[PDB]
Amino acid sequence: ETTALVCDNGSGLVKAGFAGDDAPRAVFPSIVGRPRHQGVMVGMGQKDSYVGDEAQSKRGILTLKYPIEHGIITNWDDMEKIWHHTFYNELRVAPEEHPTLLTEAPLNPKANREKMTQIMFETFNVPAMYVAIQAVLSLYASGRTTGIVLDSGDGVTHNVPIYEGYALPHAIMRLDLAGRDLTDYLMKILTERGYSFVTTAEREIVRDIKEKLCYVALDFENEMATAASSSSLEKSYELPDGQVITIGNERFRCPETLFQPSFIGMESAGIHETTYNSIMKCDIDIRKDLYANNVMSGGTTMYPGIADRMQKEITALAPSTMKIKIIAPPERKYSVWIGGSILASLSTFQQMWITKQEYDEAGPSIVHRKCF
C-alpha cells in the first residue's frame, strides 16, 4: 500500500520521486541562496533563504552555496533545508508514512551514512530507509547483471565492476574530478579571450555554456590544428544581459581535463586509464565480460563524442583480439534514480530495509552492517 520514495541525492542536482515510476518528478539543483545586498522595501515576503529553482530565479542578488562538495555533506543545516523542500514543497508528501531510499558514492567516510540515518530517522521520522551505491543502481537500470560502471556526477567520478551480481570492492576506483572541476577550468580558460567570470551566480552561466557548447574531440592534436587553421569550430553564446560571446578551441579543451587531468595540476590518470586499471585489478576470467559491458552513467557523460573517445582509448589500451563495447543510453543521466525505482519495487527487497525498531535498538551504526 505504501509507496517508497527514491531520492537520488547528487552533488549538483537532486532527483526525487516515487518508486515504480519511469522518470523522477522533482529534479532541481541542490543549492541554498542567501541575500547579499541591503533590503530597503518593507514587506513583500523577503525570505532569508531560498532553496532550489527559486534560488536560480533570484541568483543575481544571492550568494549560492552547495552543501554537498565532492559527495561530502559539509553543511548539514542546508542539507536539512533541501530535504525539507524536497519532501514538503516539491513532492508534497508526508515523510512519516513512506520509506525513503538514498544514494551515495563509494569510498566515502562513515560519518556521512550515520548522520543521514540520524537525520532521516529523528527529524523526518520515516518508517524505513536504505542507502545504496550509485553504480549498482546504474547497473540495475541498465537491465543486466555483469559490467563495469563509470559514474561521474557533479563532484565525484567513481568506477565499480560487478560480475554476476557479485561486486569486487578491492577494484573500486574513486576520483575527485567531475563537472565542478570542469566548470572551474572553463572559468579559468575563458579569461584568455577576455571574458571575466568570478561570482557564484555567473558560475551557473559558465555551467550552462559547458552544457550547451562543449564536446569531446576524437583526436586532440588534430582538433588543435583544425581550430588554429580555420574558424569553423567557433560558436557564439548569448549572455542574459544581451552580450554575445564566442568560443573556439575552448569547447573541447574543457572536457579534455577528464582525459588529461594534468591540465588542473592533478597527477592522477584519466578516466580511460582508470577504467583500464579497474579491469586489470579484477580476476583473469571476468575481464572478457567487463570489456564488452562498459556501462556509462551520470551527468558529465552527456558530452557529444565521449563514447567514441572512450572506445578509441580503451581499444588502444586493451589487447587487439577482444571486443570493447560501451553502453551509453540517451537517458543515462537519470540511471541512478531509475535503478533506485527498480530496486525499491522488488518484493525480494522489502525485508532488508532498516526499520525504526532496528535503529532504536542499534543506534546509527545499523547502516554499516545492513547497507553494503
Ligand X SMILES: Nc1ncnc2c1ncn2[C@@H]1O[C@H](COP(=O)(O)OP(=O)(O)O)[C@@H](O)[C@H]1O
Residues that bind ligand X (CB under 6 A): 10-13, 153-154, 179, 207, 210-211, 298-300, 302-303, 333
Closest by alpha carbon to 36, among 189, 247, 200?
Answer: 200
**277 binds its own copies per the rule CB under 8 A:** no
**280 binds its own copies per the rule CB under 8 A:** no
36 binds, among Ca ion, its own copies, ligand X, none (CB under 5 to 8 A by kind): its own copies
The 1-20 site mask, x for binding Ca ion (CB under 5 A), equals: ---------x----------
Q: In this structure, are residues 126 and 100 in contact, taking their beta carbons and an 8 Å threshold?
A: yes
Q: In this structure, are residues 5 and 15 in contact, taking their beta carbons and an 8 Å threshold?
A: no
**170 binds its own copies per the rule CB under 8 A:** yes
Q: In this structure, are residues 10 and 68 in contact, taking their beta carbons and an 8 Å threshold?
A: yes
Shortest distance in whole angstroms from residue 281 CB to its own copies: 8
Shortest distance in whole angstroms from residue 19 CB to Ca ion: 18
Shortest distance in whole angstroms from residue 11 CB to Ca ion: 7
Shortest distance in whole angstroms from residue 31 CB to its own copies: 15
Q: Which of residues 93-112 bind its own copies (CB under 8 A)?
A: 107-111
State which of residues 118, 200, 311, 315 lies at the interface with its own copies (CB under 8 A).
Answer: 200
Query: Cα–Cα distances in Å, from 149 out to 177, 286, 289, 294?
Result: 16, 14, 13, 6
72 binds, among Ca ion, ligand X, its own copies, none (CB under 5 to 8 A by kind): its own copies
Do β-strands 326-327 and 294-298 pair in parallel, antiparallel, or remain unpaired? parallel
By beta-carbon proximity to its own copies, the closer residue of 14 and 173 is 173
Q: Which of residues 41-80 bind its own copies (CB under 8 A)?
A: 58-61, 63, 72
- Set of cell numbers at residue 308: 567514441
Q: Which of residues 328-367 bind its own copies (CB under 8 A)?
A: none
Shortest distance in whole angstroms from residue 28 CB to Ca ion: 14
Q: In this structure, are residues 112 and 371 in contact, taking their beta carbons and an 8 Å threshold?
A: no
The 2-41 site mask, x for binding its own copies (CB under 8 A), equals: ----------------------------------xx----
**253 binds its own copies per the rule CB under 8 A:** no
Do β-strands 147-152 and 13-18 pair in parallel, antiparallel, or remain unpaired? unpaired
Shortest distance in whole angstroms from residue 243 CB to its own copies: 15
Shortest distance in whole angstroms from residue 184 CB to its own copies: 10
Q: Return all residues near 153 (Cβ < 8 A) that are at least 6 apart.
A: 10, 11, 12, 105, 134, 178, 179, 298, 299, 300
By beta-carbon proximity to its own copies, the closer residue of 4 and 55 is 55
Shortest distance in whole angstroms from residue 282 CB to ligand X: 25
The 265-304 site mask, x for binding Ca ion (CB under 5 A), equals: ---------------------------------x------
Contact positions vs its own copies (CB under 8 A): 36-37, 58-61, 63, 72, 107-111, 163-164, 166, 168-171, 174, 176, 188, 191-194, 196, 198-201, 262, 264-265, 267-268, 282-286
Contact positions vs Ca ion (CB under 5 A): 10, 153, 298
